[PDB]
Symmetry: D2
Subunit: 464 residues, 4 copies
Amino acid sequence: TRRGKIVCTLGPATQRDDLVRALVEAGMDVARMNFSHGDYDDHKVAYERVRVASDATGRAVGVLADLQGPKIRLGRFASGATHWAEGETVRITVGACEGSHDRVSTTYKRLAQDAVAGDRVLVDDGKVALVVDAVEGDDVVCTVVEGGPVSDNKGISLPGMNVTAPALSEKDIEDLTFALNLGVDMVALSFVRSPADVELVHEVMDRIGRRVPVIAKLEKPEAIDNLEAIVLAFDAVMVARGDLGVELPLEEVPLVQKRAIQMARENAKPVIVATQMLDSMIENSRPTRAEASDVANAVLDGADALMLSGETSVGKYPLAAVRTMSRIICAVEENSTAAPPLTHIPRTKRGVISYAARDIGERLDAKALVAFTQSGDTVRRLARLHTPLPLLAFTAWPEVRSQLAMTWGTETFIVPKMQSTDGMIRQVDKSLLELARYKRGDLVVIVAGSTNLIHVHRIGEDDV
Amino acid sequence: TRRGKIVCTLGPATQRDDLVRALVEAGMDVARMNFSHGDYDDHKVAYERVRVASDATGRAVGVLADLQGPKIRLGRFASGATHWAEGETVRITVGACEGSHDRVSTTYKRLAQDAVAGDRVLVDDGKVALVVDAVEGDDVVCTVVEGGPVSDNKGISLPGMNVTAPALSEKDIEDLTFALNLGVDMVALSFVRSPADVELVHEVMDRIGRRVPVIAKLEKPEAIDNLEAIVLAFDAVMVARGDLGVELPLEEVPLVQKRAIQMARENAKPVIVATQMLDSMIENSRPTRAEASDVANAVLDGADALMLSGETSVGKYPLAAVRTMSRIICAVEENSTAAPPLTHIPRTKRGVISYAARDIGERLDAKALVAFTQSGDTVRRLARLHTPLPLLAFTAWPEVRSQLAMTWGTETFIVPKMQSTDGMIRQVDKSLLELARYKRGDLVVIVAGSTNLIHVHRIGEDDV
Amino acid sequence: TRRGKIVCTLGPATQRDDLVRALVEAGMDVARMNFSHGDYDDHKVAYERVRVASDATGRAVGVLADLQGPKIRLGRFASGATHWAEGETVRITVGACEGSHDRVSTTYKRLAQDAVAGDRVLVDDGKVALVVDAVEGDDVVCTVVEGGPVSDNKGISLPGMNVTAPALSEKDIEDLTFALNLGVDMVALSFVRSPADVELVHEVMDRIGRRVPVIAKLEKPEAIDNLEAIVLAFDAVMVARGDLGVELPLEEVPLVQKRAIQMARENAKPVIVATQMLDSMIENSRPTRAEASDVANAVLDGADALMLSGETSVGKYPLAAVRTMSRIICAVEENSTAAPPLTHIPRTKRGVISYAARDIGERLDAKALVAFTQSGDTVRRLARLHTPLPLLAFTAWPEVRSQLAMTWGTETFIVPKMQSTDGMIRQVDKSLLELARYKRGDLVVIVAGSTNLIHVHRIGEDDV
Amino acid sequence: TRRGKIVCTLGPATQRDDLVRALVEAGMDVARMNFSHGDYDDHKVAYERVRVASDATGRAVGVLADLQGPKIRLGRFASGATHWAEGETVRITVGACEGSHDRVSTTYKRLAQDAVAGDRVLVDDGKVALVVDAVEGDDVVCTVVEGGPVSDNKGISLPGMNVTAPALSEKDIEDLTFALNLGVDMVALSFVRSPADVELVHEVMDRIGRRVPVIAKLEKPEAIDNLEAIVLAFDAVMVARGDLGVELPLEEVPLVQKRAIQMARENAKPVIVATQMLDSMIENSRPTRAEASDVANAVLDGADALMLSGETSVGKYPLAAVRTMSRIICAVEENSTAAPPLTHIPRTKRGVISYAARDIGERLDAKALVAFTQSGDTVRRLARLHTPLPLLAFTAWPEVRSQLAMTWGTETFIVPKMQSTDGMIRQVDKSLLELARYKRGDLVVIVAGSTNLIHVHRIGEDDV
Ligand SMILES: O=C([O-])C(=O)[O-]
Ligand SMILES: O=C([O-])C(=O)[O-]
Ligand SMILES: O=C([O-])C(=O)[O-]
Ligand SMILES: O=C([O-])C(=O)[O-]
Ligand SMILES: [Mg+2]
Ligand SMILES: [Mg+2]
Ligand SMILES: [Mg+2]
Ligand SMILES: [Mg+2]
């Protein structure tokens, strides 16, 4: 069964009765609540349906809160929605107004003072393109160059233009607080630009008295220039290909994706690949050949997890998308679970032991390898190795089971806190014997202790 | 500049004035004439516009004739086109009729006698799905399971069901003949199943007194079981992902693609990857993140050439598709031109010398590798190696320049037939000096003779 | 300090007062008692002086009993000693006589019935050579071809001629018994030919009620044809180059030596290299350049131990030989301790863990590897790896300390039978702390249990 | 047949009738004339017997002139020869005298002013050892520590003490001149210390109007510190182990030997290994096991050539020594001709092509590699690769055939100068066809031109 994890985004299409349960049963490992849409009641209902489904099926399911970030968007139109056609002049002003088809506002108040002539403006991730003709006082005058649809509050991106905006907006902080009190397991931050951005998130968490892992979404050039620093300061990364393919040339995105996955893996941080993987399944029951290829290739790149966005949140086939994503992942993994070799050589006790434990397990045909861990850190160092052996984490903290839900190839077990190696072994055999694929005699390799011990153990027997 | 080749499909969208010229100027290396659509006049006009554009720009452009093969299609509907909806019963009969919405004919006359209850029927490569309920006399009764649109003569696929049909239909043979007299450079055959299929194509060519390279399109399970035999009997392969993803589970297609490219490269046969690479650009000016990824990944897989089908043949952005495909290819190649290592070890004189010539060229920082060749065979053995050095073929046969247009990384030069090594060197220096990248002093490596010589030569200097 | 072990042979030159002690202090790791010379009183005195010296210095010293085997030798001469000169005819008869210079007896009673015309006869390992002219009744008539000295009972070898003789003679069995009662640690058997030879030694040991490790000396062609079988049935091997270079062409001996060392190492059996390593030091205070090279090369080949024979047993510089041998070994090891890579890949629990333990130790810069073992088996699997880390064996059996004295790189510690992992760790820290260069904080890797545990431990600290 | 070359030293034992011829027929590839012994008439007679034997057998035989260098030696004794015994005081004075047993002169006039108390004095390469007690005025007072024999003019070495002496003495220059006029092919210089030493030899050669290759003998610490510089400035190196093992600790010599051979091979310079390889064959018809091992190990180290000194020059078995040396070399090579991998990567045209030519030859099972060369430079770059293919040099200069006689694996052919590639090929086929084991159809690889061409050619056939 499947090693690569699947992240699904909740929204309108999953609000109907017991669709969230259906997703979990179909293989969803992490549920993303997108704070760009919906109200707090919406998020709250969805959060609870996930907890119920996780508890009712016994599948681990993380809840991931995605903060909107400093997203730049259009203001409001008189008609609600207009149409921008190849040829037209359009004004985007920092001054407030109830925008009309030719004139409209933005949330970015430094637009006029930061846009220059020749700047490109991409709307809704490249559905409509404009070029800046002039900055007159408080207005940015533009000519539509590729036409299409514009609603209220749709997102625009100005490639190249250096944006000045705080990493967390007022909305974000409110939304972060709400999510932390609600009890989410992880937080993603959009439009991350430097390593210092995590410290702002950390300040808010410390104020409220609760921390969780923070995921940096990579969708900005500055993020890619500081990729290593970012992967080190944050707990995980999401390759956010939607905005990444408008903030950067779309032709560069495929190599950036591979570079980020490798960088994450070398540092034992989870990496998620997002956006448009099975885009066409928003309308169609089967994906395109490129979409199947894209998912297969993200698995071979070595991604911990792949994400569905519109495919589950607003589309007509949320369940089939998840099922289809899962089949592709499985088809690839059945053939081989091999990932790109890592170039870094373990110098840390935990790392060194993890390599060794894999070697032993693989050479001895072990049925599984088992790690005890507090924060998951030892398990993540084993996960990046991409062994075909079942990787089984044992922990006392139950929130850690939810956090490891987005780590490659890993199932987690909650157990009471232990005070002897004898304890650990009895514990393991007990926990594992309750599954049908584990019988007395099965050979496993156990890593334990702050980790400093490898133990080759046959289930049931007294080898300790 | 670009090493990977681009194949474009001509049709309605490229018939407008000087669009074919525009494609060639945008980088089209091979033009595919799809005999599933259009009349002989259409093909003839398009063929001539390609010859003109190739001659007027000086870019090599192959013309590839795609034979329809034993495609199974629906017959004709009374109303021309109906709608098949999730729930309905539908009959597909081998008897002739002017089919109505509930009842319709097929071209496959063994349908009733070969279809069985529970058989799936996929229409138009998975836009509509049906399941066989009963075979009553001459009719195949079906229940629509995923609904959508059905026109006249649309293609259906029955996964699993063993088809009995000759590799070349009467239509194919006529179309092959017409194309050979018209003067195409290559021929692709659809729905290839065994190595013996090429012998049928060869019989027709011999009758007419003209041969060209034959490309096996891989879109059938039997083709994949005989992959090695097929790659050896045919001159090239196209991974035809459209039908391949309905004849086989779509989740398996990505690994089949990689396996075929590797198999082609090990045998120095060109491989093309086809269908849905930038599918969304039929309607949109920019592709999806999955589509960009799919193209990038086919280049890294090691494909000689990538193909556009509907993106150029019927869509709204044929030029942009080609330009976009080219940018992605270039973005990938700029980073690296490295392909998957080959596992076979050269035992053939020409092969062994090709490896050696690459080694020399790379270690000496040579500006280019130059091969003389009759059929292109030595050049193809060098092309599969994927060196970053310009690969330059020299030949007397002008049709060979068109055939090498779909071989990785390769530019070809026509020269008069030569009868001394002194001649070859003067020839090379002359041909190469007429370009801007080549100046006196530039170091190149020349392979020559049936090939048995390597010559390290500085342009201009007397070192023969 | 030194990793490669040194075996010394005791005899007349080491019988003077406290020379045995001097050898032990100079680095002798194993003392060989050669039963081809001396009486039981001699062996007994020497054995006791070794036990005393081992106990008084605290250096481990094994005692190795070398059984003469089916050595073929001349009988007795009237004059005691004669001279065989290039040109002369000589008879070697199976009948008893008090041989003169023209006529003399042999111990081999099948000589006449097994020698044929043209057979070569080498005396004293190639000091004198003869050729067989005729077999007349009970005599083998020979022509001296290379002249030199012949005393009574000197050893002859007939290259090629198939010898029929029991692996253990009556003398051997008596000598084996005497040695087993005396309390030697190992036994070497000369002229081994098949794997079944060890079973004969085992029968004698079982009768007497005491087993020790048996070393096969390799000095026969049949031994080299069955090298793998022999290395598996015996506990160790000695490349006995003296007789090996007359039983085989001397030019083949160097590759046979390397092949045997590799074969031993692949199976974690100790290998000793013997005879003429510093031959000239029998007369001279310094060796030849070839001799220094030969010792250096045996270390690089990967030999557990090198042996001195005449250099210590009869020569004028027994102490200097040992000191000189030690300096060369150390000079080589200081540069590097790297041996030829092993080709076999660990499939056994013990083996797999040993590799892993080395990896951990090396990558973590551990001060030492520590193995607990019953028979030494786990330690030998680590020793063949040739790590630069100190390798420290812990055992309850004191005879095992003597047996491991001929295993590469290994020091042994006697300890009471600990009965808990807590025990083992306290035990290790205690034992190791009693030396300088082991201090609190030093990092070591411990292998333990039938072995199934690796434990990375800092000396002193509580991390069990 | 044999790839490794053999150097023999001529002297008293080879002066008897037709022994030089016998050596050449036994496989001598280079004859060393040692100018430390004999008069000019002696050298002259020996030189001519070598030319005759080389011409009469058709075997290439180089003549190598070994210059004594700044050898420090004792003066003359009243009794001619005395005996220095463990215990005695001995004076070695820079003042002239007809030394007696207690008092004697040296050639080194800076002895008293450069020797200090505690200095070791080794005589005749370690046969007698002394320690300096005092420097009184013009005398160096010594205590014998290891006793033995002292003749007139025997060589002493003072390890550590920095010697000041010109690289060429007056005797050397005379001897160099005489040898150059006599027509030797190579020159070796003893006690080389820096790269600048070759420039002094070059000055003398230029004065006299004739150059030959110069071999640096390595027998000094300063030589080993400047090993790379020396290997680059000189044309070849000899590991002169006799003095090297007294100027340096003898235990270090074996690794210095391997380091020098590797350094030579990386720079395509021939390396010779000298002194005491079969030392015992001065008195005995068969060597020791260490001696056989030493020769085998020098071949595996990758030495171009091994040298005999006293074994042929003064001993009782000059012919057998050469035969025995040859058998060992062949025994090793039959198994494999593989040498230690080289770490440098070819960046020079000639080097790069040599690698390539080997690759082609080996992969195509070519019967031979053929190189054309002026100075031998291309051939030496191929020789260091140690391919199992016959390596055949073609040159117009006949002295080059003599110089290549000490280069691994290489036979040379003299041919008239050619002025077309057609010429070269006809030339090769002609030259090679005159041997059995070259027949029409045999495949060879030819390197040619200043080298810039590889040509895979079947003997006889027209494929130019
Ligand atoms: O936010 C995202 O996931 C994106 O932009 O692709
Ligand atoms: O024919 C094709 O290109 C296909 O089916 O994908
Ligand atoms: O017995 C031995 O050791 C030998 O023959 O070398
Ligand atoms: O000069 C030599 O040959 C030596 O010293 O070994
Ligand atoms: Mg985004
Ligand atoms: Mg098709
Ligand atoms: Mg023996
Ligand atoms: Mg010397």
